[PDB]
Design a protein around this motif. Structure first.
Motif, short mmCIF file in Angstrom:
data_model
loop_
_atom_site.label_atom_id
_atom_site.label_comp_id
_atom_site.label_asym_id
_atom_site.label_seq_id
_atom_site.Cartn_x
_atom_site.Cartn_y
_atom_site.Cartn_z
N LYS A 92 0.34 6.48 -5.05
CA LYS A 92 1.06 5.83 -6.14
C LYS A 92 2.46 6.41 -6.26
CE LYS A 92 -2.99 4.26 -8.58
NZ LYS A 92 -2.84 2.92 -7.96
N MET A 93 2.79 7.28 -5.31
CA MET A 93 4.10 7.91 -5.24
C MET A 93 4.68 7.57 -3.87
SD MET A 93 3.17 11.73 -6.57
CE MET A 93 2.48 12.02 -8.19
N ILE A 94 5.99 7.65 -3.76
CA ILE A 94 6.64 7.40 -2.49
C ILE A 94 7.83 8.35 -2.47
CG2 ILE A 94 8.20 5.61 -3.35
CD1 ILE A 94 7.72 4.18 -0.62
N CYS A 95 8.08 8.96 -1.32
CA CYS A 95 9.17 9.92 -1.23
C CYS A 95 10.28 9.50 -0.29
CB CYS A 95 8.63 11.27 -0.80
SG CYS A 95 7.09 11.74 -1.63
N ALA A 96 11.46 10.04 -0.54
CA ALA A 96 12.63 9.74 0.27
C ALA A 96 13.50 10.98 0.34
CB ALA A 96 13.40 8.58 -0.36
N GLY A 97 13.94 11.32 1.54
CA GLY A 97 14.78 12.49 1.69
C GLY A 97 15.07 12.83 3.13
N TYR A 98 16.03 13.71 3.34
CA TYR A 98 16.42 14.17 4.67
C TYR A 98 15.79 15.53 4.89
CZ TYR A 98 20.03 10.57 4.57
OH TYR A 98 20.70 9.37 4.50
N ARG A 99 15.32 15.76 6.11
CA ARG A 99 14.69 17.03 6.47
C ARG A 99 15.58 18.19 6.04
NH1 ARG A 99 13.04 18.72 12.75
NH2 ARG A 99 11.94 20.67 12.23
N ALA B 267 18.04 17.83 -3.82
CA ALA B 267 18.60 17.80 -2.47
C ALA B 267 18.37 19.03 -1.60
CB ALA B 267 20.10 17.51 -2.55
N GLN B 268 17.32 19.79 -1.89
CA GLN B 268 17.04 20.97 -1.08
C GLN B 268 16.41 20.55 0.24
OE1 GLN B 268 16.35 24.65 -3.35
NE2 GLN B 268 14.84 23.44 -4.48
N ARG B 269 16.55 21.38 1.27
CA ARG B 269 15.96 21.04 2.56
C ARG B 269 14.44 21.05 2.43
NH1 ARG B 269 17.71 26.81 4.61
NH2 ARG B 269 19.70 25.68 4.75
N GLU B 270 13.78 20.16 3.15
CA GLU B 270 12.33 20.04 3.15
C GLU B 270 11.74 19.80 1.76
OE1 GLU B 270 11.07 23.73 5.18
OE2 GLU B 270 11.28 22.55 7.02
N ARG B 271 12.47 19.09 0.91
CA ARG B 271 12.00 18.77 -0.43
C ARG B 271 12.41 17.34 -0.77
NH1 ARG B 271 8.09 22.07 -2.80
NH2 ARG B 271 8.79 24.25 -2.90
N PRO B 272 11.70 16.36 -0.22
CA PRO B 272 12.00 14.95 -0.48
C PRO B 272 11.92 14.63 -1.96
CG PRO B 272 10.55 15.17 1.41
CD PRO B 272 10.54 16.49 0.68
N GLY B 273 12.73 13.67 -2.40
CA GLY B 273 12.67 13.27 -3.79
C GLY B 273 11.38 12.47 -3.93
N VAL B 274 10.75 12.56 -5.09
CA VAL B 274 9.51 11.83 -5.32
C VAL B 274 9.76 10.69 -6.29
CG1 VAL B 274 7.11 12.00 -6.05
CG2 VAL B 274 8.23 13.96 -4.99
N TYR B 275 9.25 9.51 -5.94
CA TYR B 275 9.45 8.32 -6.75
C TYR B 275 8.13 7.62 -7.07
CZ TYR B 275 14.16 8.87 -4.82
OH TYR B 275 15.39 9.37 -4.44
N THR B 276 8.13 6.85 -8.15
CA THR B 276 6.94 6.10 -8.51
C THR B 276 6.91 4.94 -7.50
OG1 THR B 276 7.10 6.67 -10.86
CG2 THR B 276 5.85 4.68 -10.29
N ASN B 277 5.76 4.76 -6.85
CA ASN B 277 5.59 3.70 -5.86
C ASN B 277 5.35 2.40 -6.61
OD1 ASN B 277 5.24 2.39 -3.43
ND2 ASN B 277 3.17 3.18 -3.04
N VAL B 278 6.43 1.68 -6.89
CA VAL B 278 6.37 0.46 -7.68
C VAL B 278 5.35 -0.60 -7.27
CG1 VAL B 278 7.71 -1.48 -8.59
CG2 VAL B 278 8.76 0.79 -8.40
N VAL B 279 5.20 -0.86 -5.98
CA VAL B 279 4.25 -1.89 -5.54
C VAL B 279 2.84 -1.63 -6.07
CG1 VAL B 279 3.45 -0.85 -3.38
CG2 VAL B 279 3.61 -3.36 -3.59
N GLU B 280 2.52 -0.36 -6.33
CA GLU B 280 1.20 -0.01 -6.84
C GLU B 280 1.07 -0.34 -8.32
OE1 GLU B 280 -1.71 1.31 -5.35
OE2 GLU B 280 -0.57 0.45 -3.68
N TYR B 281 2.16 -0.82 -8.92
CA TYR B 281 2.15 -1.14 -10.34
C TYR B 281 2.50 -2.58 -10.68
CZ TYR B 281 1.72 3.87 -11.01
OH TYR B 281 1.25 5.17 -10.97
#
Length: 237
Positions: free
Chosen positions: A170-177, A213-227
């Motif tokens: 129910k979460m989705i993440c986005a970020g750079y290594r 924006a720390q390395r190896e710490r993707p931002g966490v988002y609410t996975n909208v499609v699940e809602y």
């Protein structure tokens, strides 16, 4: 937004800035227009918020400076928080704001499409996070709406970066290594817009992260499609 750039006016017409008038007026969180009387945002943005009477939704805004005492806004009639919501890190960080009046769509303010369940197999390669949030962990609300292109990461990959948490479907993440670009304080509730087939979809809602924006710490988002079922249920009079 960390590591982002200034947005073009009207570039994210669904993005709204949610203000609280208490004690004095200030930007509280981001949000997205998904219906003429509906804003989709994050549940944890209403901590301490006893009444919707202190809320003001401003649409068609690029610079916070455009917002003055004489600027028109949308009042909030009802705050709808997911009944399973407890705190950002445990998920269900989603809320609906029913506006007192309807938004008249225009080039400056229009809704973003909700994701389709049939697209959970799609690989969004053009996603952007936007907001007036911090440019640094220890910063302040920015004047100009910022934008940053950030790649989606698999939940398995995200879970590996947050071993002390449970990253659910129910979460989705986005970020750079290596980090460098990510949402930050003040961006919460904002949209994670992904362009697919020349159409923008609200894939996620800015929720939380380990710092910003720390390395190896993707931002966490609410996975909208699940809602989408929840949204329909809560918005369908």
């Amino acid at each position: 937004i960390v590591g982002g750039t200034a947005s073009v006016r009207g570039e994210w017409p669904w993005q709204v800035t949610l203000h609280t008038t208490s004690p004095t007026q200030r930007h509280l969180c981001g949000g997205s227009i998904i219906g003429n009387q509906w804003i989709l945002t994050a549940a944890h943005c209403f901590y301490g918020v006893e009444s919707p009477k202190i809320l003001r939704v401003y649409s068609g805004i690029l610079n916070q400076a455009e917002i003055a005492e004489d600027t028109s806004f949308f009042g909030v009639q009802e705050i709808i928080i997911h009944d399973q919501y407890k705190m950002a890190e445990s998920g269900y960080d989603i809320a609906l704001l029913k506006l007192e009046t309807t938004v008249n769509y225009a080039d400056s303010q229009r809704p973003i499409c909700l994701p389709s369940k049939g697209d959970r197999n799609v690989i969004y390669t053009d996603c952007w996070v936007t907001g007036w949030g911090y440019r640094k962990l220890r910063d302040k609300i920015q004047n100009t709406l910022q934008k940053a292109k950030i790649p989606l990461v698999t939940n398995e990959e995200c879970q590996k970066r947050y071993r002390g948490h449970k990253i659910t479907h129910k979460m989705i993440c986005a970020g750079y290594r290596e980090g460098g670009k990510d949402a930050c304080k003040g961006d919460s509730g904002g949209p994670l817009s992904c362009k697919h087939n020349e159409v923008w979809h609200l894939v996620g809602i800015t929720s939380w992260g380990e710092g910003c924006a720390q390395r190896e710490r993707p931002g966490v988002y609410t996975n909208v499609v699940e809602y989408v079922d929840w949204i329909l249920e809560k918005t369908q009079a």
